[PDB]
Ligand binder design. Structure first.
Ligand SMILES: [Cl-]
Ligand SMILES: [Cl-]
Lengths: 134, 128
C-alpha cells in the first residue's frame, strides 16, 4: 500500500535468488567455520536447507516492507527463528550474521531513501533473533 | 484470529509441505526430473524447491494478512522474472502445494486457506 514500498518489493522479488546467493557466499567467506566440518553448512543438504531458510527470511522481510507492518515478524517470524535454531542447530550469532549479509546484499541494489526505508525490517528481524534466550 | 494459527502451521511445516508437494509433482510429471526437465540435475532440484517455497510463503503471508493484493502485486512480477522456466508447470506445482497444505488443516481452516491457492492459480493462468 505504497508506491515506493511497491517498487522496493518489486526489486527484492526480481532478485531474490541473486540476493540470497550473494549473501550466503559473503557469510561463508566471513565465517569459514560454517562450511567447516561440524558447521551448519558443511554438507550439501545442510547448505541447501540454509539457502532455503535465508530465502524464507528475505521473503518475510520483503512482505513486511510491502505491507508496512512488522507484526508478521513477531508472529510467524519467531516460529521460523525457533525452527532454524532448534532443527538446524544454528547458533544465534550465525542467524544474525546471515540476516546482516542478506541486509547488505539487499541494500546494495537500492539507493538511499529506499535503503533507509528498507533497513528497519532487517534490523527488526535481527533484534527478534538476538533476544531469543530471554 | 484463526489465520495466525493457520500461518503458524504452514510456517512450522514449510519444508515438509514443500518436500511433499515437490515429490508429488515429480511423481505426477515424471518428465520434470527426466533429462531436459527443470528438476533433472541436483542444482535444478534445489532451484525448483526454492521457487515452490517462495510461492508457498507468498500464499502464507497473504493468508496471515487477509489480503490478496500482494498476489496481484509481486506475484506476477516473480512469475514474469522467473519465466524470462515454463509457466504451465507452475500451475500443477501450486496445486500440489495446496493439497500438501490442506492435508494439515481441518475443514474451516482448509475452506479459509484454499481460496489463496485458487487465486494464485487463476492469476497464473492468465499469463502470456
Ligand atoms: Cl547468546
Ligand atoms: Cl548491519
Amino acid at each position: 500500500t505504497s508506491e515506493q514500498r511497491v517498487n522496493i518489493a518489486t526489486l527484492l522479488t526480481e532478485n531474490k535468488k541473486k540476493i540470497v546467493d550473494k549473501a550466503s557466499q559473503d557469510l561463508w567467506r566471513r565465517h569459514p567455520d560454517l562450511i567447516a566440518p561440524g558447521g551448519i553448512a558443511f554438507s550439501q543438504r545442510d547448505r541447501a536447507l540454509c539457502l532455503r531458510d535465508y530465502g524464507w527470511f528475505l521473503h518475510l522481510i520483503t512482505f513486511c516492507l510491502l505491507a508496512g507492518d512488522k507484526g508478521p515478524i513477531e508472529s510467524i517470524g519467531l516460529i521460523s527463528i525457533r525452527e532454524m535454531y532448534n532443527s538446524l542447530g544454528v547458533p544465534v550469532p550465525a542467524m544474525m550474521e546471515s540476516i546482516r549479509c542478506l541486509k547488505e546484499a539487499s541494500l546494495s541494489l537500492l539507493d538511499e531513501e529506499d535503503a533507509n526505508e528498507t533497513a528497519p525490517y532487517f534490523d527488526y528481524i535481527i533484534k527478534a533473533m538476538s533476544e531469543f534466550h530471554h
